[PDB]
Structure 1
Amino acid sequence: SLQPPPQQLIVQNKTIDLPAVYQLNGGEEANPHAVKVLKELLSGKQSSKKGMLISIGEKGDKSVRKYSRQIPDHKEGYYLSVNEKEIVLAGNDERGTYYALQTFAQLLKDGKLPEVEIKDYPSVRYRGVVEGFYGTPWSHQARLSQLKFYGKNKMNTYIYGPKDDPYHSAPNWRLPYPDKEAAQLQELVAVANENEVDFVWAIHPGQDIKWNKEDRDLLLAKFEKMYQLGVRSFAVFFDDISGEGTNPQKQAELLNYIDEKFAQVKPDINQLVMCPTEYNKSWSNPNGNYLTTLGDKLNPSIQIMWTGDRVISDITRDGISWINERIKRPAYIWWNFPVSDYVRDHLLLGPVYGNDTTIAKEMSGFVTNPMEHAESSKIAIYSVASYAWNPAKYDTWQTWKDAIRTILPSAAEELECFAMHNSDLGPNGHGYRREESMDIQPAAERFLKAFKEGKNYDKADFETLQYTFERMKESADILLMNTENKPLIVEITPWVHQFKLTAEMGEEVLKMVEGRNESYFLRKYNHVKALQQQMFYIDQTSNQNPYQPGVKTATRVIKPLIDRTFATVVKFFNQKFNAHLDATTDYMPH
């Protein structure tokens, strides 16, 4: 696969060997970030003056003069070619050249390259991640890892805005970062730059902002401090606030002032972005003037963010048309998936789907708001990178599989198994849901239907359930022990324990269905109760946050099926043996 998939690809069914001996043409004039990647791939392979030509450069460079007609006339666009005669890596701009190298790195398969001609560019101008959730902000190390992941996947945007950073939100938005954090932010900016990512620093001042000179200057002074740390893109967020800070005329005036006195004054500022107080259709007043005021008054270069029809929603043609009409520019999408900050006891590891794939022209930008679990979020982030670069060719399931295989190549099938059953959010105040456990859902439905009305189940279904529980245990134990991405395993570990126990309870409940005799059934029954108590202990010891504490897993299909089957066979046993066993399914000490 190539991820994201390029706009145009012609494959010749030959392959060649990576030289071997090579002449590098343009390494002194091309994007240093791209040349660095190229030289790492060519490591210990000898440059000379005869032997295979490799030309690298940006449109306008001497090295790629011969290829100027093939270089797409798009921002971040590139032309790549591999044949017998030569290799060409030619960006329309410096970032384009870096992107050619990221595709080239994926083509190279143990010393071999396919013979290809690629013409490529993004459909959406700004693509990336807003760290913009409530909860424990991402660690320094996580963020460093994220930035490298973004470059590899051609995301050009990282918006720093954790709701619970005191120097981002109120009241200490007015204060400069202490030295330690300031130095960390400086290093993030440097790393972002190396990976061709725009570090966008957001401020969230609206809960206690006064519309006076004091707070204006404090804000601009903070932006100046961030500038000194290397920050060249900026945002002001007015989401999830009440009070005078919600005044659209004043917001517009503040943003225009920042634009006019700062964004348009510095030698080298890039994005200026704002998130409105009315940030989705349901939170908007169609009879109020809020969004039309922003649309009319905000300077045309300023971006305006949007989460869709609801706080949590997927982006539709009709939804984006509605906002675009009011804000008088293409919305810069803030997509609230996989963010789990309102369903904190769940991991959301399923595919990225639901967003219209034909509306690239109607958005300025598309960023994902991820989980507080940084590594876990890479499944979705990789998919959003693919979707935003090439929406027309976006393939939900293939990209999910490619994401997982990239993140954990040593145990991809185990991670697929875990992720497929850790997808849904459960019921929530936002009404947002995802599919989960789809493959076994008909087998489950048929198995359980057979019980509630009469009987009896198909053997192949009982066996599918059995196969699933077995596979869930292999997956749980192998992931726990995996050392390729330790940060990821640390993140998911509590859920992995709960997932293993779910599978064991499943196996035990299915032995109760097969109930050969009274005492065997009681042995299984007692084992299930013990497994229920073990799940209860994890739910009360792990992930004990103030909001949705604990650890839920395989909640959509698997846990309901196990629990219902348990209750059913206990019912039957109690009839058959005139017994009074407890049929309840969650352990309660009180």
Structure 2
Amino acid sequence: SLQPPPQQLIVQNKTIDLPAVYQLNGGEEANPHAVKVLKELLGMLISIGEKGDKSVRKYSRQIPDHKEGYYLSVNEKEIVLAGNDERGTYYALQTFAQLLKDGKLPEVEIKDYPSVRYRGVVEGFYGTPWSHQARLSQLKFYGKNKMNTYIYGPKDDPYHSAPNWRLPYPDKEAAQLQELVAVANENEVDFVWAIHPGQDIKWNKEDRDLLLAKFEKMYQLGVRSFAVFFDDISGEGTNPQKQAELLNYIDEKFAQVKPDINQLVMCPTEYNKSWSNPNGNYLTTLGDKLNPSIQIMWTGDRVISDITRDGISWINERIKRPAYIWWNFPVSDYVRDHLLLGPVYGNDTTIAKEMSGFVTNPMEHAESSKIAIYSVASYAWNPAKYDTWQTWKDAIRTILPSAAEELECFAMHNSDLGPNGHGYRREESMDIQPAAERFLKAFKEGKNYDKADFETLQYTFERMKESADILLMNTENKPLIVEITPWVHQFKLTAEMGEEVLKMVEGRNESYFLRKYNHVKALQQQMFYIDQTSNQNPYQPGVKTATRVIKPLIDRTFATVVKFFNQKFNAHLDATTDYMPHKMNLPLQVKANRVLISPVEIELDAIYPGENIQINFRLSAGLQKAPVKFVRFQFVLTIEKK
């Protein structure tokens, strides 16, 4: 499965062998980055070059007349790799590398080019910025998948955002950035350095010069594309006239003055329809006043959304140019306890002409995001032929060949975001969703359930456990495994709980049932400890997994079978589904050093120093470290733990 799929492919159902002896025509005059790839890969004539080179004159009418276009031919007599331009030749080679299987090439002719001009990744999330090593890995991944754009803009980099956007990077970070630009250039990626000055920018000469001064420093490190972001700010930095004037100044005094600057992009304050005032002048001001070479970014009809024909028509009409899409998936920075490892879908596949670019905002988990990134690369290059599920499967097998089926199992049940303030959800566990939904309907109402449905759930829990143990021990992609490990532990526990809960449904005798029930309570407690010890970030601490379909099913099944046990044996077993050490009909929650009522008396499991209490029917009272176990009366106690 060539990824991205070429615009045009004719296959001959013959194969040849990579020539053991070959003649290379055009090596000294073709893109040096393309020649190095070809030489790594390896008489029969092999012709490599860009349109205009002597080496490729015979094929000049086969070469697509598109930026980043190429002609690739393999037959009995010869191999041709001909770009419309240097980047096209590199890309011919990336397709060539995928065709070569076990010293053998199929007989093929390809004519190819991208449908969207700018394709790639914006590292533009809140959270821990990617590591240097992660970024190096990403850049190489982008070259293989024909992504030409990497926008550097981590919200939490103090040299990118306020107030230290004014300061040059220190030497060590500066040397790192320089290395990234070198590696980007080698993989035919535009490194686009972004700045986020809007929260404390003064519209004066001092701050304008400081911004230009910073861009000059980045230029000296080798940066040749630049962005200015005005997202998620308030105050005087939201002024569109001043924003347009600053960007026009950067364009006129810097972008159009240097010998070799490429992209100049801006992200607006009104960056989606819901955040834009239909009766305000903001977007029209930018559209009218911004120099026509400046790109304007857009996230769709909401902060988190997929791109539709109508939504993009709306923005394009106002900004008077095709929108440069900032797509907010798989970014998880607002559901930080979830991994979003499902397929890329929901974006209109017929609107390439209406966009100047398409970039993905990924997770803080660099390797994990490669599933979506590979898929966005495929989509943006050939939207017409974009295949959601095949691409997801191809991504997984690329990322983890040694355990592709195991990663598919884990990813397929780690796709949804759960409820959230952005209203954005994805499908999860759809394969088993109907079996789950039947089983539980039947079971809850005392009608007999189908054996096949019970077996399906059983098979699922078994395969999850296998997948988890195998993924833990995988050494093919260590950085991926480090990223997901906490979720994998939680995924195994979920599967073990499901297995035990189903043995309870098969309920042999009272004694066996009680063993199973006690095993389940222990598993709940183990899940709570992971949720409190792993991924303890300030915003959505912990680890959630298989949340849309599997966890609800296991929970409701458990509560149901305990209710029936209590009726049959006149018993009083606790049917609660999440473990909670503190006692309070709403469920308590524990988040860091807070104990919380999910929106009279609370008894903690020990005496703690009390920090404060926040109630809300903004009530507040510090407890000055006063010992506290009981608390009688949002509703949030904070304690020293801490």
Q: Following the alignment from structure 2 to structure 1, what is the Cα–Cα distance between the partners of residues 166 and 509?
A: 72
Structure 1 position 174, deviation (Å): 0.2
For 1:205-245, what per-residue CA distance to the aligned partner results, in whole angstroms no more than 9, with x for missing partners?
Answer: 00000000000000000000000000000000000000000
Structure 1 position 455, deviation (Å): 1.6
Q: Following the alignment from structure 1 to structure 2, what is the Cα–Cα distance between the partners of residues 449 and 194?
A: 57
For 1:88-145, what per-residue CA distance to the aligned partner results, in whole angstroms no more than 9, with x for missing partners?
Answer: 0000000000000000000000100000000000000000000000000000000000
Structure 1 position 453, deviation (Å): 1.7
For 1:431-489, what per-residue CA distance to the aligned partner results, in whole angstroms no more than 9, with x for missing partners?
Answer: 00000000000000000000222221100000000000000000000000000000000
Query: Is 1:356 aligned to residue 356 of structure 2?
Result: no
Q: Following the alignment from structure 2 to structure 1, what is the Cα–Cα distance between the partners of residues 530 and 24?
A: 57
Query: Is 1:194 aligned to residue 186 of structure 2?
Result: yes
The 3-state SS of whatever aligns with 1:341 is coil
The 3-state SS of whatever aligns with 2:461 is helix
Q: Following the alignment from structure 2 to structure 1, what is the Cα–Cα distance between the partners of residues 503 and 214?
A: 64
The 3-state SS of whatever aligns with 1:377 is helix
TM-score (ref. length: structure 2): 0.91
Q: Following the alignment from structure 1 to structure 2, what is the Cα–Cα distance between the partners of residues 284 and 564?
A: 42
The 3-state SS of whatever aligns with 1:177 is coil
Segments of 4+ moved more than 2 angstroms? none
Q: Following the alignment from structure 1 to structure 2, what is the Cα–Cα distance between the partners of residues 196 and 317?
A: 30
**Which position in structure 2 is the counterpart of 1:333?**
325
**Which position in structure 1 is the counterpart of 2:310?**
318
The 3-state SS of whatever aligns with 2:368 is coil
Larger Rg: 2
**Which position in structure 1 is the counterpart of 2:588?**
none
Q: Following the alignment from structure 2 to structure 1, what is the Cα–Cα distance between the partners of residues 522 and 292?
A: 63
Q: Following the alignment from structure 1 to structure 2, what is the Cα–Cα distance between the partners of residues 478 and 225?
A: 47
Q: Following the alignment from structure 1 to structure 2, what is the Cα–Cα distance between the partners of residues 192 and 286?
A: 40
Aligned-residue RMSD, C-alpha: 0.3
Q: Following the alignment from structure 2 to structure 1, what is the Cα–Cα distance between the partners of residues 520 and 445?
A: 24
Q: Following the alignment from structure 2 to structure 1, what is the Cα–Cα distance between the partners of residues 420 and 108?
A: 48
Q: Following the alignment from structure 2 to structure 1, what is the Cα–Cα distance between the partners of residues 478 and 49?
A: 37
Q: Following the alignment from structure 1 to structure 2, what is the Cα–Cα distance between the partners of residues 39 and 457?
A: 62
Match of 1:175 among 167, 173, 188: 167
Q: Following the alignment from structure 1 to structure 2, what is the Cα–Cα distance between the partners of residues 396 and 234?
A: 32
For 1:29-86, what per-residue CA distance to the aligned partner results, in whole angstroms no more than 9, with x for missing partners?
Answer: 00000000000001xxxxxxxx100000000000000000000000000000000000
Structure 1 position 342, deviation (Å): 0.2
Q: Following the alignment from structure 2 to structure 1, what is the Cα–Cα distance between the partners of residues 563 and 183?
A: 61
Q: Following the alignment from structure 1 to structure 2, what is the Cα–Cα distance between the partners of residues 478 and 218?
A: 52
Match of 1:505 among 490, 497, 508: 497
Q: Following the alignment from structure 1 to structure 2, what is the Cα–Cα distance between the partners of residues 177 and 581?
A: 61
The 3-state SS of whatever aligns with 1:376 is helix
**Which position in structure 1 is the counterpart of 2:568?**
576
Show structure 2 runs of 5+ residues with no match: 583-642
TM-score (ref. length: structure 1): 0.99
Between structures 1 and 2, the one with greater strand share = 2
Q: Following the alignment from structure 1 to structure 2, what is the Cα–Cα distance between the partners of residues 405 and 173?
A: 40
Q: Following the alignment from structure 2 to structure 1, what is the Cα–Cα distance between the partners of residues 438 and 473?
A: 35
The 3-state SS of whatever aligns with 1:118 is strand
The 3-state SS of whatever aligns with 2:364 is coil
Q: Following the alignment from structure 1 to structure 2, what is the Cα–Cα distance between the partners of residues 54 and 506?
A: 58
Q: Following the alignment from structure 1 to structure 2, what is the Cα–Cα distance between the partners of residues 15 and 280?
A: 50
Q: Following the alignment from structure 1 to structure 2, what is the Cα–Cα distance between the partners of residues 160 and 472?
A: 36
The 3-state SS of whatever aligns with 2:68 is coil
Q: Following the alignment from structure 1 to structure 2, what is the Cα–Cα distance between the partners of residues 456 and 340?
A: 41
* Residues 511-522 of structure 1: pairs in structure 2 closer than 5 A: 511-522=503-514
Query: Is 1:464 aligned to residue 471 of structure 2?
Result: no
* Residues 297-312 of structure 1: pairs in structure 2 closer than 5 A: 297-312=289-304
Q: Following the alignment from structure 1 to structure 2, what is the Cα–Cα distance between the partners of residues 456 and 185?
A: 63
Match of 1:142 among 134, 139, 147: 134
Q: Answer 1 or 2: higher relative contact order, Cα 8 Å, separation at least 6.
A: 1
For 1:346-399, what per-residue CA distance to the aligned partner results, in whole angstroms no more than 9, with x for missing partners?
Answer: 000000000000000000000000000000000000000000000000000000
The 3-state SS of whatever aligns with 2:367 is coil
Structure 1 position 262, deviation (Å): 0.2
Q: Following the alignment from structure 1 to structure 2, what is the Cα–Cα distance between the partners of residues 157 and 519?
A: 62
For 1:468-527, what per-residue CA distance to the aligned partner results, in whole angstroms no more than 9, with x for missing partners?
Answer: 000000000000000000000000000000000000000000000001000000000000
Q: Following the alignment from structure 2 to structure 1, what is the Cα–Cα distance between the partners of residues 309 and 156?
A: 33
**Identical amino acids, percent of aligned pairs:** 100
The 3-state SS of whatever aligns with 2:576 is coil
The 3-state SS of whatever aligns with 1:519 is helix
For 1:524-555, what per-residue CA distance to the aligned partner results, in whole angstroms no more than 9, with x for missing partners?
Answer: 00000000000000000000000000000000
